[PDB]
Each structure stands twice: as C-alpha cells, then as structure tokens.
Design a protein around this ligand. Structure first.
Ligand SMILES: CCCCCCCCCCCCCC(=O)CSCCNC(=O)CCNC(=O)[C@H](O)C(C)(C)COP(=O)(O)OP(=O)(O)OC[C@H]1O[C@@H](n2cnc3c(N)ncnc32)[C@H](O)[C@@H]1OP(=O)(O)O
Ligand SMILES: COc1cccc(Cc2nnc(-c3sc4ccccc4c3OC3CCNCC3)o2)c1
Ligand SMILES: [Cl-]
Ligand SMILES: [Cl-]
Ligand SMILES: [Mg+2]
Length: 384
C-alpha cells in the first residue's frame, strides 16, 4: 500500500511520463517555510549528530552497519563497508556534518539508527539540479517494522530542505515508488574455488572444480600496457575525459575538479583508479571501489573481498579490452570477484568477459522529480 511513500512527492505506482516531462512534483518551495523542529522519535530515543571525521563516532556507525546493514537475498552475505570507506563516502566536497544523522537509545547510549546525505549536482534528462544523494539508511535489526525509517527519512528531508535543496537521488534493492531505472548486477569470478566454497558460485558434472578454475583464468598482462594508479597531477585529465563521456547519458552527476579529486584519487581498500596517459593526456581510465561482504556462518571464510565497477572510459582500446583490464587490476589487488551493473556500456561486455547474471537488481529513484523512465544503459551514475 506504500502508506508512507504515497504521502511523499514521488510517482504513484501507475504513473508513467513522456520524455518531454522533466520537472519537480512540487515547485516554488520556500526555505523560510521549512519546519525548524526535529521530527519526534519514540520515547527513550534521541537524534545524535555523528562526526564522521572522529574515529570513535565513525566506529559506532561502522559497527551499526556491520551488524544491521543490507543482506543478499538469501541472507548468506551482509555488506561490510569499512570505516575508511565511510569516511570517504561521507566527506566529499561541501558535505554537511548535519546530514549525517544518528539515533541513539538513550539508556545504553548506543547508536541504533543512521541515515546520511551528501550534496551532488545531478543531470537528469539534460537539466542539472542541486540534489542530495541519500545512503546508509539503517535501523537496528531488533527495531525493524516499527516505522522508524519514515522518521529518519522525514528528518533528513527537513535538513536538506533547510539548505534550499528540494530533490534527492537514491538506490535500493527493494522496489519503491517508483524507479526511474532498474539495473541488474552481474559478477565476474576471480577466485572461483573460494566463490564455490562459500556458495557464491556452483559446479556441475560438465563443470568440475579444475574446469571452473581454468574457465576464469586470466592472463596477467594488461591490454593497455601503461595503465597506472592515478596521481594528483591526473585530476584535470580525468575531469576532462570523464565529464565529457558522461554527457551522453540520461542521469549522471556533474563533477567539479574538486569532486574528481575526492572520488577518484586512490585510497587503499577503498577506491582504485588507473589511468592511461599519452603524452601528458589522460586517454583512458578504470575505477572500482572495495566493498567487502561479511560471510554469515561459513566455517572457513569470514569475508568476501569484492571490487565494484565505478567509472570506466576508453578512447585507445575497445570497451571490452578496457573492462578486461579492469578485471585484471582487481585480481592484482586480491579481490575475489568483480561486480558490475548493467549501466552505461557495461552489458555489452558481460557475455564475452564471462560475467554471470546475479540475483536481483538495483532500482534508481529520484525524490520530488517527475520524468520518463529509461533503460539502464542510459544511467550514467554509480552510487556507493
Ligand atoms: C529533498 C531531499 C529528500 C531526502 C530523502 C530522499 C528519500 C530517501 C529514502 C531513503 C533512501 C535510502 C537509500 C539507501 O540507504 C541504500 S538502500 C539500503 C537501505 N538499508 C537497508 O536495507 C539495511 C537493512 N534494512 C534496514 O536497516 C531497515 O529495513 C530499513 C531502515 C531499510 C527500513 O526500516 P524497517 O524497520 O524495515 O521499516 P519501517 O521503519 O517500519 O518503515 C517502513 C517504511 O520504510 C520504507 N522503506 C523500507 N526500506 C526502504 C528503503 N531502502 N528506502 C526507502 N524506504 C524504505 C518501506 O517501504 C515502508 O514505507 P511504506 O509504508 O510506504 O511502504
Ligand atoms: C555479496 O553481498 C551482497 C550483500 C548485500 C546485497 C547484495 C546484493 C546487491 N545489492 N546492491 C548490489 C550492487 S552490485 C553492484 C555492482 C556495481 C556497482 C554497484 C553495485 C551494487 O550496489 C552498490 C551501490 C548501491 N549501494 C550498494 C552497493 O548488490 C550482495
Ligand atoms: Cl509528519
Ligand atoms: Cl576470509
Ligand atoms: Mg522500524
């Protein structure tokens, strides 16, 4: 019934809009009218302002997500974003501490809830809008189905509106009103014995262990011999290469040079970016972020080490040769699997590079924005 979602400026389950429609649900919003009072929490619960730059606050958020965040459809895996990933994800340029919102249970003084936003310029159907990207919504497992989530959502909405920002972007595995795009995820095995042992992957009588291993073997040589970790000097080159590539899509963030530096400069165990420089010019780029999963109840392994395709552009190779190199660089950095969504040009290489179709899909939503939906090939933004 979406008793909560139907009260919000998002499309109804049956709404479809033509390609020309591209506008807010509610316009002419006035900052001066935004409620100034915090949304009421149940008795015994309080808002808490997280300082993600403070290691101990950051560690509380970490512990909350580790224990209570998103699981795969069979509840075999749970996302285990690292503390250093959270810091990177949450302190991008012009970020507001005030958009990093915790809920504590007063008597234990423990964090039981969290939601966060960061500001981003989003171009939707060629209109660039100041938006907030919402992420890390989490309610403790002991407190599910008590309608806390709408309170967290209303409170971040109010705080976003205070900054005169009226649109948001978010992604979920769950179906809500109403996705502007739906993207399946696909997986390319690197450490197949491990994937076989934890049941990320399966064998049959055609496919013995040694045959599966051979299938997914890769040559330890790049197609683009000079692909190297990105360095500060490459920032303008990356801003030029990526900013222009992205113009082609129907939904993409507009990056400043300061954002390109934040989002791409390598950080071990968080973000990996490689570039191919041809006489001072950045001609190709590969990026992926590190997002391990906790393996629940497996005697041998605790962690699934996984690389997540971020942004990839080539002008000197084929997209297939570029993504092959992506897989090889993931393998070199001890990732067990390389994951991609069917956005941008990615689907075109999945068959040949031996990706398998996953279990489900990631839905893209906008808040307070009416437009035509589109196939995932036209989505040019990957969230964290
Ligand atoms: C202008 C700026 C605007 C700013 C805001 C933009 C919008 C941002 C929206 C947020 C974007 C986040 C993106 C992001 O973080 C990435 S998607 C990951 C969300 N987190 C998880 O899945 C972690 C594990 N699950 C949980 O922690 C709980 O199940 C959560 C807290 C998800 C729901 O708590 P609960 O204890 O299970 O449920 P109740 O409290 O009783 O509440 C039920 C209501 O919550 C609706 N619900 C459930 N999951 C949702 C989800 N993933 N988005 C939006 N709504 C969701 C549900 O449909 C229902 O409403 P309805 O009755 O209408 O159907
Ligand atoms: C293997 O462990 C898990 C744990 C929880 C949920 C899943 C299912 C799933 N839920 N979202 C995604 C994916 S696959 C992928 C590939 C490339 C880039 C992004 C993603 C992605 O979602 C990202 C971004 C949105 N927030 C979650 C991670 O995958 C698998
Ligand atoms: Cl209300
Ligand atoms: Cl392990
Ligand atoms: Mg609840």
């Amino acid at each position: 019934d979406y008793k909560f979602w139907y009260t919000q400026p998002v499309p109804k389950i049956n709404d479809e809009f033509n390609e020309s429609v591209n506008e807010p649900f509610i316009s002419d919003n006035k900052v001066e009218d935004v409620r100034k009072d915090e949304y009421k929490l149940p008795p015994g619960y309080s808002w808490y302002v997280c300082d993600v730059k403070d290691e101990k606050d950051r560690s509380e958020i970490y512990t909350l997500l580790t224990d209570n965040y998103v699981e795969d459809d069979d509840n075999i895996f749970r996302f285990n974003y690292s503390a250093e990933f959270l810091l990177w994800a949450l302190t991008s340029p012009n970020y507001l501490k005030t958009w990093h919102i915790g809920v504590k249970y007063d008597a234990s003084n423990k964090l039981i809830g969290f939601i966060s936003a960061i500001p981003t310029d989003i171009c939707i159907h060629k209109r660039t809008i100041k938006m907030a990207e919402v992420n890390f919504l989490c309610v403790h497992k002991t407190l599910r189905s008590k309608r806390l989530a709408p309170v967290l959502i209303k409170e971040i909405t109010r705080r976003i509106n205070l900054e005169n920002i009226w649109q948001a972007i978010y992604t979920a595995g769950v179906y809500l009103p109403k996705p502007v795009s739906d993207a399946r995820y696909y997986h390319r095995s690197i450490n197949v014995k491990k994937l076989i042992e934890i049941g990320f992957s399966s064998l049959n009588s055609r496919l013995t262990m040694s045959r599966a291993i051979k299938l997914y073997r890769v040559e330890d040589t790049l197609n683009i011999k000079n692909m190297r970790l990105m360095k500060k000097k490459d920032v303008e080159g990356v801003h030029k290469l990526l900013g222009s590539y992205l113009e082609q899509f129907n939904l993409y963030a507009v990056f400043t040079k300061e954002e390109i530096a934040h989002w791409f400069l390598p950080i071990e165990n968080v973000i990996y970016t490689y570039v191919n420089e041809e006489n001072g010019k950045i001609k190709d780029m590969i990026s992926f972020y590190s997002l391990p999963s906790q393996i629940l109840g497996n005697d041998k392994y605790s962690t699934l080490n996984a690389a997540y395709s971020f942004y990839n552009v080539t002008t000197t190779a084929t997209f297939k040769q570029l993504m092959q190199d992506a897989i090889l660089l993931a393998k070199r950095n001890n990732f067990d699997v390389f994951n991609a969504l069917e956005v941008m040009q990615n689907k075109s290489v999945f068959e040949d590079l031996k990706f398998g179709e996953g279990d489900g899909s990631l839905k893209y939503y906008l808040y307070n924005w009416k437009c035509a939906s589109f196939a995932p090939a036209h989505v040019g933004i990957v969230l964290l």
